[PDB]
Amino acid sequence: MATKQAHKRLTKEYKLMVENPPPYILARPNEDNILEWHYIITGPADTPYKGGQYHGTLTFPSDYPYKPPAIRMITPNGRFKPNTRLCLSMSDYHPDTWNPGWSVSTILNGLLSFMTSDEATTGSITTSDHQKKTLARNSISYNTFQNVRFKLIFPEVVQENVETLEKRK
């Protein structure tokens, strides 16, 4: 069981996202484990990610709020190696400078802003703009058929994706 402190904080962080949803970012705790969050980043305009659907996870440790989450991205994307901890300023590569007061939306906006930059970090990969665009186009099919956890966590989005894939055809 998560500590009562962590459970209270992370519940509040979800409510804050419901009340003020950050553009391009949907995220929520697992319904049976408040420490394991899943997110979907929608690729923004003005990037080669435009229209992509990028599933990943923010795994808060048992000692949250005093230790950062592990950040991973599951959907192939051309910027981050899939299923790999990512070295970001607000991540578990940086426990010494962790600020407990960072909100989940702040952490995720840090991931999105890093994604759309070209800075290398542990977990990043090198692809072309064309490869990123192909991965963005194919991300919805990927998450529907090649991503076992996506359907378990986001069944309502799988249902949307099926309709999107049909409308594309």
Author numbering: 1 to 169
Question: What does the paper behind this entry write?
Answer:
Ubiquitin-conjugating enzymes (E2) play a crucial role in the attachment of ubiquitin to proteins. A subfamily of E2s, including yeast Ubc6 and human Ube2J2, also mediates noncanonical modification of serines, but the structural determinants for this chemical versatility remain unknown. A rearrangement of the Ubc6/Ube2J2 active site enhances the reactivity of the E2-Ub thioester, facilitating attack by weaker nucleophiles. Moreover, a conserved histidine in Ubc6/Ube2J2 activates a substrate serine by general base catalysis.
To uncover structural determinants of noncanonical E2 activity, we determined two structures of the UBC domain of yeast Ubc6 by X-ray crystallography to resolutions of 1.21 and 1.33 Å, which were virtually identical (RMSD 0.394 Å). First, the loop connecting the four-stranded β-sheet and the active site, which harbors the HPN motif in canonical E2s, is shorter, and contains a conserved GRF motif (called GRF loop). Second, a 12 amino acids long segment, which we will call the Thr-flap, directly connects the crossover helix α2 with helix α4, while the short helix α3 of canonical E2s is lacking. A hydrogen bonding network centered on Arg79 of the GRF motif connects these two segments with each other, the crossover helix α2 and the active site cysteine. In contrast to the published Ube2J2 structure, the active site is well resolved. It forms a distorted helical structure stabilized by hydrogen bonding between the side chain of Ser91 and Leu88. On top of the active site Cys87 lays an aromatic ring (Tyr93), engaged in a π–cation interaction with Arg85, which itself forms a salt bridge with Asp92. A conserved histidine (His94) points towards the active site Cys87, consistent with a role in the enzymatic mechanism of the ubiquitin transfer reaction.
